[PDB]
């Protein structure tokens, strides 16, 4: 996970949106250790979700607990720290990170 | 207390005479084939390049210089067993090279 | 490569003869002897090589040249 | 003493012949059939009045008999019934079985017997390495407190417990007066043992185990001799090897050198040291240990599970010190990821909400373990909403309430932790 490839850099997520997906992906994992500025844990969090170890029943992959995000929270919160509007790019996360690279 | 008993060892010669009694009864080449074809191709080199040689004179070769070294440290024994030692030494081999006539 | 006739092989070949025990510094003597023996058969034998106007060596000429030494071999054709 | 010969051999199934696990062990030459098998040039030599052939005898010129090996029938020049047929005619010496003083069971020779004469060939089963290594747990678990094994080669030992014969109960000697050899009988190795010099009737037959324990703890030896090392293993061991749990040593900075070097200055210079077992901790060789400051992560994972395992006041305390010492901001990240909060929760609760110490010592150690949490990078109550340490700084400032410096300090140490936020987490469906 902490190679120099990117699992990110397969989807239509800008390089500037990488943290804010690793971000997504850590907390739909129910992780709590994580502190933003560890990109390290952020990796491996993204890292078990789209590829994980163990999969469970009849699931490929751990991206469909991203379906339980309150993303209209989360852009409330970014809107109001950082003055960033980025509703539409959480939605565009979500589905680039639940199927890479779809045919649209 | 899953300890093991150790069987210790040998007396030194008891497996030398052992090896002797093995070696004195089979009668294969003891000089490794490879190496020797190389040694000859090195000594051979030295006087005209671009020289084979068959694999039957390199047989011949190798069972000659085994009889010369078999036969040397026969007299070799004879010697250290004349100076009341059990153990060869290179005076011996000089000697036994120098009564043989081989050295001058 | 004279170093390929390694210490256990010399050491088989002392132990045919009878030999119970081997001094440390007998390996490069024994070494030194072989190189000798092998040298003036060598030589023999190319020349005898030379003579037959030919470019690889028989072992014909090799038992010759050992038979001319008072070595004779038997087995290999003589 | 009393004989017992009767009462040992019924502890066990009586053996006349080594039992093989399968027939691929114990065959001489690793299995090579050896189709010329070492035939000795001895002529026969029999006795017309007794009609017994006296070839290959104790002064005789056999070569076999030399170089360990049995003449088999059939085979060699010297006849059947020549005098190298040891192991296969079982021509034992005659021995009886005493009861010692402490060591149990001993073999006592009935007759005066020769030098080099052979006394009797151990018996028992020929197994394989994992074999003998799931019989070993087996009878470790049964906790037997004595060795039944013996390695008739590599990879191959042969087995006392359960079947074998009288030579299972020779006691072993630091100057034995017996000796375990290995020969060669056909095409198979069996292991006899031979008098190493002149034995007179009732003297105890001893040879020397050399023991390999194999990681095992070393037995006392009680043998007796003058030349004693007085315990069993030609391997020093003592208790030179753990004095605590390998995380809880390496949190602490001590190494296998370390945990030698105490044991090695007290314990052979007439001091008291227990027997291997970290239930009880030893206070004073954690306050003898040296302390050095914390630069990998892995060493500051071992502290936290020695945090999570330890309960011991000094290894908390000396732990504590070294954390002190400690000042890579990486460390003290990975240790805030591992939660270090938390286990400095139960850490202060045990030492100053339970007492088992005093107030004046409690005091220095919470005086010795608010430093470093005053010091640690903190930048988010995330962190410390992990542990609600918080809540126990609060019970102890309250209970130790006359101890005004801790107070104070814990007051700083609210009003720091209380000016960081709370880092965001996402809401999640319900
Ligand atoms: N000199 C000695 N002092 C104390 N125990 C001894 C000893 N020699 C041998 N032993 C013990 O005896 C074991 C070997 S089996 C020997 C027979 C058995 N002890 C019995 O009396 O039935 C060893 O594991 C060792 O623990
Ligand atoms: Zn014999
Ligand atoms: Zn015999
Ligand atoms: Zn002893």
């Given at each position: 996970p902490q190679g120099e490839m990117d699992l990110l850099d397969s989807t239509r997520i800008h390089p500037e949106d990488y943290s804010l997906a690793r971000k997504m992906a850590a907390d739909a994992l129910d992780?709590?250790?994580?502190?933003?500025?560890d990109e390290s844990a952020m990796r491996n969090a993204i890292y078990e979700m789209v590829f994980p170890r163990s999969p469970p029943k009849?699931?490929?992959?751990?991206?469909?607990?991203?379906?339980?995000?309150?993303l209209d929270d989360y852009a409330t919160e970014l809107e109001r720290k950082?003055?960033?509007?980025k509703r539409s790019t959480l939605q565009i996360i979500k589905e680039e990170l639940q199927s890479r690279y779809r045919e649209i | 207390t899953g300890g093991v008993m150790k069987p210790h060892r040998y007396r030194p010669g008891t497996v030398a005479l052992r090896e002797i009694r093995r070696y004195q009864k089979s009668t294969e080449?003891?000089?490794?084939k490879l190496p020797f074809q190389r040694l000859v191709r090195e000594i051979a080199q030295?006087?005209?390049?671009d020289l084979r040689f068959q694999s039957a004179a390199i047989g011949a070769l190798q069972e000659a210089s085994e009889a010369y070294l078999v036969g040397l440290f026969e007299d070799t024994n004879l010697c250290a067993i004349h100076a009341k030692r059990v153990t060869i030494m290179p005076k011996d081999i000089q000697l036994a090279r120098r009564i043989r006539g081989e050295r001058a | 490569n004279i170093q390929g006739i390694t210490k256990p092989a010399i050491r088989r070949l002392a132990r045919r003869g009878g030999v119970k025990r081997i001094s440390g510094l007998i390996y490069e003597e024994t070494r030194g002897v072989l190189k000798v023996f092998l040298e003036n058969v060598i030589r023999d034998a190319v020349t005898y090589t030379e003579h037959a106007k030919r470019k690889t060596v028989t072992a014909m000429d090799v038992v010759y040249a050992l038979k001319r030494q008072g070595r004779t071999l038997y087995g290999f054709g003589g | 003493p009393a004989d017992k010969t009767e009462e040992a051999l019924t502890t066990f199934k009586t053996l006349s012949q080594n039992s093989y696990?399968?027939?691929?062990?114990?065959?001489?030459?690793?299995?090579?059939?050896?189709?010329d098998g070492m035939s000795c040039d001895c002529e026969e030599n029999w006795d017309?009045?007794?009609?017994?052939?006296?070839?290959?005898?104790?002064?005789?010129?056999?070569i076999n008999r030399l170089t360990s090996i049995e003449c088999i029938s059939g085979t060699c020049?010297?006849?059947?019934?020549?005098?190298?047929q040891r192991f296969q005619k079982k021509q034992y010496a005659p021995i009886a079985v005493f009861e010692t003083e402490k060591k149990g069971y001993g073999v006592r020779a009935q007759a005066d017997i020769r030098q080099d004469a052979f006394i009797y060939e151990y018996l028992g089963e020929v197994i394989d390495e994992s074999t003998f290594r799931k019989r070993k747990e087996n009878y470790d678990n049964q906790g037997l407190e004595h060795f039944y094994f013996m390695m008739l080669q590599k990879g191959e030992f042969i087995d006392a417990t359960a079947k074998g014969g009288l030579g299972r109960f020779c006691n072993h000697s630091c100057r034995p007066n017996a000796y375990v050899d290995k020969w060669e009988v056909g095409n198979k190795l069996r292991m006899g043992i031979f008098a190493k010099r002149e034995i007179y009737k009732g003297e105890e037959i001893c040879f020397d185990?050399?023991?390999?324990?194999?990681?095992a703890n070393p037995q006392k030896c009680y043998?007796?001799?003058?030349?004693?090392?007085?315990?069993?293993?030609?391997?020093?061991?003592?208790?030179?090897?753990?004095?605590?749990p390998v995380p809880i040593a390496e949190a602490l900075g001590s190494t296998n050198a370390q945990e030698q070097r105490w044991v090695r200055l007290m314990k052979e210079q007439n001091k008291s040291i227990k027997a291997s077992?970290?239930?009880?901790?030893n206070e004073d060789y954690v306050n003898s240990l040296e302390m050095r400051p914390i630069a990998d992560k892995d060493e500051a994972s071992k502290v936290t599970s020695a945090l999570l395992k330890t309960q011991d006041y000094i290894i908390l305390r000396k732990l504590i010190e070294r954390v002190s010492l400690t000042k890579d901001p990486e460390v003290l990240k990975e240790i805030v990821r591992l939660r270090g909060y938390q286990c400095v929760a139960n850490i202060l609760t045990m030492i100053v909400l339970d007492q088992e110490q005093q107030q004046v010592d409690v005091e220095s150690f919470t005086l010795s373990v608010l430093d470093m949490l005053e010091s640690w990078p903190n930048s988010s109550r995330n962190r410390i909403s992990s542990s609600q340490i918080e809540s126990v700084l609060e019970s102890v400032k309250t209970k130790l309430k006359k101890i005004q410096p801790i107070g104070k300090k814990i007051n700083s140490l609210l009003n720091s932790w209380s000016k960081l936020e709370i880092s965001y987490k996402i809401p999640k469906s319900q």
């Open positions: 992780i709590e250790d994580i502190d933003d500025d009849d699931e490929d992959d751990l991206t469909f607990k991203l379906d339980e995000l309150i950082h003055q960033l509007k | 080449l003891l000089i490794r030295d006087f005209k390049t | - | 696990q399968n027939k691929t062990l114990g065959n001489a030459h690793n299995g090579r059939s050896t189709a017309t009045v007794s009609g017994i052939n006296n070839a290959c005898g104790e002064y005789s010129e056999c020049s010297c006849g059947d019934d020549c005098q190298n185990y050399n023991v390999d324990r194999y990681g043998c007796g001799e003058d030349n004693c090392i007085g315990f069993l293993g030609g391997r020093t061991q003592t208790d030179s090897a753990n004095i605590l077992d970290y239930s009880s901790i």
